[PDB]
Design a protein around this ligand. Sequence first.
Ligand SMILES: COCCOc1cccc2ccc(-c3nc(CC(=O)NCC(=O)O)cs3)cc12
Length: 325
Amino acid sequence: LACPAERSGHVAVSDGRHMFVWGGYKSNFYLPREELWIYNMETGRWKKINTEGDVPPSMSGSCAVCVDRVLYLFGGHHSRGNTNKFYMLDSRSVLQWERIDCQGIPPSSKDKLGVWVYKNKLIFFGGYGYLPEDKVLGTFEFDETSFWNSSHPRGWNDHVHILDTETFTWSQPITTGKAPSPRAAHACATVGNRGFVFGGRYRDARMNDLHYLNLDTWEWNELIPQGICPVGRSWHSLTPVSSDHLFLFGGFTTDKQPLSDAWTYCISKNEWIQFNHPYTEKPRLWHTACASDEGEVIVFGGCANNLLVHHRAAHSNEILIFSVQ
Ligand SMILES: COCCOc1cccc2ccc(-c3nc(CC(=O)NCC(=O)O)cs3)cc12
C-alpha cells in the first residue's frame, strides 16, 4: 500500500472516479516531477506511475484540468521562476507529457490562478507572476513586498485568457461588466455556463467576494448573498457538487488563520449554508478538492498551519472525505 508524500501547491484533477495528483512542494523542495499519483475514489487506494515525454518542471501553483481523461497543465512556479508553458497528458490509454506550441499571445508567466472549462475552451483567470510582456486586456498590480526580496518583482492580474483546444490558440474575450479585482489563490468553479470565482489574495486583504463570468456572453456579474457569508480567505477550495451547489473548504484568512470551516453555496437561492463535518481540527490551505461520482468531495494535501513560516509548516498527505450528497 504505497502512499504519496505530503505536499501543498500541487494539482489534482478527476474524472469523477479517479483523481490524478501532480507536483507541489513540501518542507523538511519540490515533489518529484515525473511522478503521477492516482487515487481511486472507490477503493481508496493510491497508485504511483512514472511519466515520460515533455515532463513539466517541478512546480507549485500550477493550474490543471481534466477533460475526457486528457490532463492539461498551465503555469506554475519552478526553481527558476514562473512559467506560462502549457502541457497535455493523455491518460486514456507509459504516460507521455506533451508540451504544446500554442498559437497566439499566451498569458503572462504566473501561478496560483484558476480555470473554467466550457466546451472546447479552457478559460484561465487571475494569478500571481511577472509583469506581462505587453499591454494586454486586463490589469496588473505589483505586490510591493516582492520589490526588495527578489531579482524580479511580481504582482496580481485580473486577466481572462482562452485556450481553444480546437486549435491550441490563445485569445482573450472582450468582457462586459465589472471584472473582479486582480487576485491570486482564489478558487474557481464551473456550473453550466457560469464560471464562479470566490475570494483570493489582493494587496492587504484575503477576500470573500463572489463573482461569475457568463462563459457564453462574457458578462461579469457580482453576487451579493443575503445573510451570513464565509470569512474572507485565500488558498481555499471551491468545488461544484450539483447543478445548484458549490462546496467550499479551508483556506487562510487576512490575519493568517488556517481555516477548517466548510460551506455550500446554493446557486438558486444565492445563499451560503455552513456544512457540518468531522474535520474541525484539520484546517487546510493550498490543498486540492475533487468531486466524486458518489456524492463526496475528496480533499488532499495542503498545510495545517501558516505555510509562510516554512521551517514550521505542517504539510499533509491526508485524504479528507466530505459526504456532500
Ligand atoms: C520568504 O517569504 C516568506 C515565506 O514565503 C513563502 C514560503 C512558503 C510558501 C510561500 C508561498 C507563497 C508565498 C507568496 N505568495 C504571494 C502572492 C499571493 O497572492 N499569495 C496568496 C496569499 O498571500 O494569500 C506573495 S508571497 C510565499 C511563500
